[PDB]
């Protein structure tokens, strides 16, 4: 026979490996691995991977993590300890399964954008996702209306955001992230809101690290 190919000098030769790791309340483990090009005098091995960014689904805790596997957490390699990639918080999010998931055509959709201030010297932007809940056994039909007077809508925004700006002013990014992923805030918002109009599927759609001091 006469082959059409033959391996001569692999390109992935000068490749060094690393491990994905971020403290905060996520497992110590080294979930997944990254890759980089060897040093070259000018090029500094573990030092190009500075602004690196990894998107990770929650399997970053062994327990009830496989369940809540829709929070897309985005992390930045913040430091490297020989052969290991250390990471701090960068971003928090969700996915299409969930987003498109809770979207029925007979309810109302609410969104609250917020700029929080953490004592850590960190600036955030947190997006909230709210949906109106029925209360009459009538499965939302063309006959069922679960709308909420626009006045009530913003009524919630005003309340939701205001709750979170105070929540952040009193926490550490390590605490905040831990809390944001937890059904803690789902319950709190649920509390302030049933006062204005009973909601369902409440979520913190997205979180962006606006400006993070490096004191």
């Amino acid at each position: 026979k006469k082959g059409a190919k033959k391996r001569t000098i692999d390109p992935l030769s000068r490749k060094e490996w690393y491990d994905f790791r971020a403290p905060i309340p996520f497992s110590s483990k080294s979930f997944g691995k990254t890759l980089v090009t060897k040093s070259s005098g000018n090029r500094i091995a573990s030092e190009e991977i500075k602004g690196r960014v990894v998107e990770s689904t929650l399997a970053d805790l062994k327990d009830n993590s496989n369940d809540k596997a829709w929070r897309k957490v985005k992390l930045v390699i913040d430091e490297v300890d020989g052969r290991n990639a250390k990471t701090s918080f960068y971003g928090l999010d969700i996915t299409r399964d969930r987003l498109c998931s809770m979207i029925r055509k007979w309810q109302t959709l609410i969104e609250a954008r917020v700029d929080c201030k953490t004592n850590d010297g960190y600036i955030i932007r947190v997006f909230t996702l709210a949906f109106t809940k029925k209360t009459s056994a009538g499965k939302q039909s063309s006959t069922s209306t679960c709308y909420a007077k626009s006045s009530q809508v913003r009524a919630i925004r005003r309340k939701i955001n205001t709750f979170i700006t105070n929540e952040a002013a009193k926490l550490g990014i390590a605490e905040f992230s831990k809390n944001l992923i937890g059904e803690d805030y789902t319950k709190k918002i649920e509390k302030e809101t049933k006062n204005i109009f009973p909601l369902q599927n409440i979520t913190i759609r997205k979180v962006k690290v606006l400006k993070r001091p490096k004191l």
Partner: protein, 128 residues
């Protein structure tokens, strides 16, 4: 024909993106946190852009007489990211597809982080 230069791979390793215009089908496999770029072969293959690469007939001309030379220079088990198609422009996905991701799977590699990277944006420039 390669060998070493900004080297060298190992390699577990790496990650390869798909993509396929409803008139093509891409195939290339770079590496991590960015990276580039040992692997490619796409549409540039068969027939006379009639059937063409739209129908995966050349997605069979994929990887095999193509990307399977990843086993060549060390690449062992990659990672996919289908982007077909452009947008917008317009979505979504092309022919290939199962031929795409599955193809490279029926050989020296492995599924990993199969993420439809297909890019679209918040209301922009209108087509025609």
């Amino acid at each position: 024909s390669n060998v070493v230069q900004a080297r060298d791979n190992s390699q577990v390793f790496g990650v390869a993106r798909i993509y396929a215009s409803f008139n093509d089908t891409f195939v290339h496999v770079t590496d991590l946190s960015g990276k580039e770029t040992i692997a490619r072969v796409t549409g540039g293959m068969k027939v006379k852009a009639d059937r063409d690469e739209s129908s995966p007939y050349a997605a069979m001309l994929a990887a095999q007489d193509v990307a399977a030379k990843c086993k060549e220079v060390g690449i062992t088990a990659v990672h996919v990211k289908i982007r077909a198609t452009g947008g917008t422009r317009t979505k979504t996905p092309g022919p290939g597809g199962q031929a795409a991701l599955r193809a490279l799977a029926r050989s020296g590699l492995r599924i990993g982080r199969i993420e439809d990277v297909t890019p679209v944006p918040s209301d922009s420039t209108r087509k025609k």
